């Protein structure tokens, strides 16, 4: 099939040339458009008051100066003259687990991908202590099977999947679960010290052990070596709440004016 | 009862002064806690790499250099002897509509309000001497709903502010989110220099802002209110997937 790839990592990390070449060996078509640089630490957003700067690698990749979002969004109203059947997004060199999703940008070209009516997938790493080479091969080979499942058992696509995979060999690897997400914020204390000319500052503190990483989670699958996938929403509106709210405000209307 | 504010604009901008004002005016206890600077424009993310640095500039305000995230989560965990009831973000000087919600600064305040177990409202105002004392007092009206009639607190309220005076307003209404960039197309154009430059077009042809969005109140002068999620994780769809995944193990 025709597949798109990108990343937030940069167009030189990796992990995003492992995944590319996996997929062509496969007997898939595959064009790469990704960011010049990390783009982590920035807004995910799009970019509507400038115009944008791109350039040409080679015949299978092109360079561009801009959020993820950019990248995507381009690629299918006019960049290039290319239908694809699916949209693919990493791998990341980190892991996006729990209450760390919604500000993500791998997860970010995913749910670009889906905006125009294309079925996408997130996959990240999830590696450890920041001389081993990561484990990309693993998670590569995870990939090239949900891309060929989805083809002959297609889902209702008003979903994306999100994936983290162990950083450890494939032979380790103990088989596929499905989670959902987990809470780790509340956890979080805070610390006080001094810097080097006597002023007080700030550090977000570690997780305590009242945090929610117990059975059925995804930060539960993770630790005993296994493969997490998450569905999670493309609509941010609560429809199970609408009439309730409702009734709530006629009750404000005739309180008032 | 006790509130705690926040924005992403500043802690000098004209929304949030008056903002806080009006609801000691009400009778309520306003504590103030705010990025240092206009940090519109960067990721929303919690900082764990460098530590925070942080200001007391009077007796209810707090200067931070960091997120709006790190100014709520900061406040809730030892900075400060005070224990509110609810949290409320704004008032932001342009609006917050469609598939920009998202990534909204102002909505990020909120957000981490409810991880840490609170209620929580976002307030915009929708700018084409702007009307905030027609925000302020729609925000003071809400709040006291809210004490009295509690909500499930599995969700957040997205309200925003049409930019007129009070005596013009018609009313409230229950809206959806909207969207208007699903359809824009890829323009080519050449800068000064003879580069190849790539613009976002403008709004499609069709676009999905017709009866019952957010778009179309404000245009008509009503006040928007959205219910928003908390949790991305889609329940309704676990049954499906875990069946998906038992014929994919079996395929050996
Ligand atoms: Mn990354
Ligand atoms: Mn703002």
Same mark, same amino acid.
């Given at each position: 099939?025709?597949?798109?790839?990108?990343?937030?990592?940069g167009v030189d990390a990796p992990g995003i040339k492992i995944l590319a070449d996996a997929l062509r060996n496969a007997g898939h078509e595959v064009m790469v458009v990704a960011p010049d640089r990390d783009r982590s630490g920035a807004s995910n957003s799009l970019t509507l008051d400038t115009p944008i700067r791109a350039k040409q690698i080679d015949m299978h990749t092109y360079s561009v100066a801009g959020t993820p979002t950019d990248c995507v969004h381009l690629?299918? #109203? $006019?960049? +290039?003259?290319? *239908?694809?059947?699916?949209?693919?997004?990493?791998?990341?060199? #980190? $892991?996006? +687990?729990?209450? *760390?999703?919604?500000?993500?940008?791998t997860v970010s070209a995913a749910m670009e991908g889906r905006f125009l009516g294309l079925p996408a997938v997130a996959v990240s790493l999830v590696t450890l202590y920041?001389?081993?080479?990561?484990?990309?091969?693993?998670?590569?080979?995870?990939?090239?099977?949900i891309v060929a499942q989805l083809k002959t058992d297609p889902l209702p696509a008003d979903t994306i999947l999100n994936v983290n995979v162990p950083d450890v060999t494939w032979q380790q690897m103990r088989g596929f679960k499905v989670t959902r997400l987990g809470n780790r914020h509340r956890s979080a204390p805070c610390l006080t010290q001094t810097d080097p000319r006597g002023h007080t500052i700030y550090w977000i503190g570690p997780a305590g052990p009242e945090q929610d990483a117990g059975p059925g989670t995804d930060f539960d699958a993770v630790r005993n070596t296994y493969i997490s996938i998450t569905p999670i929403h493309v609509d941010l509106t609560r429809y199970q709440a609408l009439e309730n709210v409702t009734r709530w405000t006629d009750r404000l209307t005739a309180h008032m004016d």
């Open positions: 099939m025709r597949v798109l790839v990108s990343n937030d990592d690629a299918l #109203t $006019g960049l +290039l003259n290319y *239908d694809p059947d699916i949209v693919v997004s990493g791998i990341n060199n #980190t $892991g996006n +687990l729990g209450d *760390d999703v919604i500000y993500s940008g920041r001389q081993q080479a990561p484990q990309y091969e693993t998670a590569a080979h995870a990939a090239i099977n």
